[PDB]
Design a protein around this ligand. Structure first.
Ligand SMILES: COc1ccc2[nH]ccc2c1
Ligand SMILES: COc1ccc2[nH]ccc2c1
Lengths: 287, 275
């Protein structure tokens, strides 16, 4: 396959991007991978920019709405698809490679061999969606094998996902650096998300409560965990039509260890039918 | 700094990071890295894998020795020196699983069939450790015996399904003079059992030649030979396609058998061509 430097090259065939990546790597360039499901926003662009600043980088952005990480009807069909906007954004950002595989190219044998995540996948986001993270980790493993990047970039917004990807990389001895990039926010604090488009004006106004609650908690935390959680709860309680699914303060690895001084506070809430996530670093007893 | 590597000698590494760094360095110097995964206690079957790896031009051979809990140290290393193997990778359980069992590989449904009957989690263990070894060593080719044919097929599923950039090489089964497939378990057989054990290979070779008369003739011939043996408890005798799906009307297939002799479980298999 041809590679035209300094412009966007789009490859659909896994073999094509694998060949181009291999060839680039062999000439000294360092391959950076930003895996996405399209519907690109400023959060994704932050990832692209982080990747682009690595000296000698060539940036590969994958766009693939992975059916394996969705449960039956109708989340997969409802996922936003804005391909023309996505590719326009990548061109504007100076990205040289977009990898846009088909479902058939990624899953020619259906679901056969898959990744089984550790117990974290059953908690928080995985509670009512027990197969979700197996879908995520299976596709990320495949993308890593196809592209063979030196570094792979993920937002901190989906923090549990990022932790599970670090687990994947450690547990399977993958030779890639996982880079977590801090959450990009709207001016009022709202975390970037492709689901923000489903907030009507009232819901958009109310949605500020998630980030306001988290940031209140982070500052309250000088007074301890209870104070932090209660400050967040108070802000969420004050918000019209925010229905909290969970609000949890955990150790930074979200694993089988108690909170000791460095934590992550995670929230998920519904505004109408729209489920929003956010999270923040918490230091306990630290001003 | 890359760990020391002495060309033409057996270099032994226990740390995953060490063998990873050495393998990477060697492939940059124009070597082709060949991986032979084993659980030690090496026999002539393993040596055939080693010789197959060695004959690839540019080869450097990595033999891993790891008893994988999820599925003779000095003597093994001496055998490898004698074969001209340059790398042995001998990690501890703690080095392979520093965080315990966490993320694992879930095989497809083939893993529940045949050998997966008595050992329903066996292949998950095998695929998980093989994936890790492939990521640590990053070989150009990886070598497995055909004797554990279902294992080999599941490894080919792993490689295809996860888009791994490695060639899987199956090596024809090494056999004792009477046909018994090589295995560390053969020495456990008493004389009566050892004599009866020849029935597995004899049944398969009979079937392979009976196959000109069709699938049923092949299966019936194999069953007759097993039926002539005392103390051979057949767990299965199945004719499948080469990927272990259902056998087609004509074409290539594989005939697999497993049996228990006393407390010792033996496996064997053979290529079958129908008609
Ligand atoms: C870097 O900040 C962000 C924020 C939200 C995001 N959603 C998906 C990636 C991502 C990144
Ligand atoms: C290539 O022949 C063989 C025969 C039996 C085997 N057992 C484990 C590896 C192996 C290889």
């Amino acid at each position: 396959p041809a590679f035209h430097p300094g412009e966007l090259n789009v490859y659909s065939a896994p073999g094509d991007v694998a060949d181009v990546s291999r060839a680039l790597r062999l000439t000294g360039r360092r391959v950076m991978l930003v895996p996405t499901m399209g519907a690109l926003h400023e959060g994704h662009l932050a990832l692209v920019r982080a990747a682009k600043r690595v000296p000698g980088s060539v940036v590969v952005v994958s766009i693939f709405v992975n059916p394996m990480q969705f449960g039956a009807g109708g989340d997969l069909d409802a996922y936003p698809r804005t391909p023309d906007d996505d590719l326009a954004q990548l061109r504007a950002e100076g990205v040289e490679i977009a990898f846009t595989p088909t479902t058939a190219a990624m899953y020619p044998d259906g679901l056969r061999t898959t990744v089984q995540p550790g117990p974290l996948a059953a908690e928080l986001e995985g509670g009512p969606r027990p197969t979700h993270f197996a879908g995520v980790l299976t596709v990320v493993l495949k993308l890593l094998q196809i592209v063979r990047p030196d570094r792979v970039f993920f937002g901190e917004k989906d923090y549990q996902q990022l932790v599970l990807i670090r687990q994947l990389v450690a547990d399977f001895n993958l030779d890639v650096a996982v880079v977590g990039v801090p959450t990009v926010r709207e001016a009022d604090g709202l975390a970037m998300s492709s689901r923000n488009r489903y907030l009507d004006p009232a819901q958009r106004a109310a949605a500020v409560a998630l980030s306001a609650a988290l940031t209140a908690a982070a500052h309250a935390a000088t007074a301890g965990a209870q104070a932090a959680l209660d400050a967040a709860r108070a802000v969420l309680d004050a918000a019209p039509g925010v229905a909290v699914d969970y609000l949890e303060l955990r150790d930074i690895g979200l694993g089988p260890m108690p909170l000791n001084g460095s934590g992550r506070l995670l929230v998920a809430a519904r505004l109408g039918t729209t489920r929003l996530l956010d999270n923040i670093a918490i230091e306990i007893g630290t001003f």
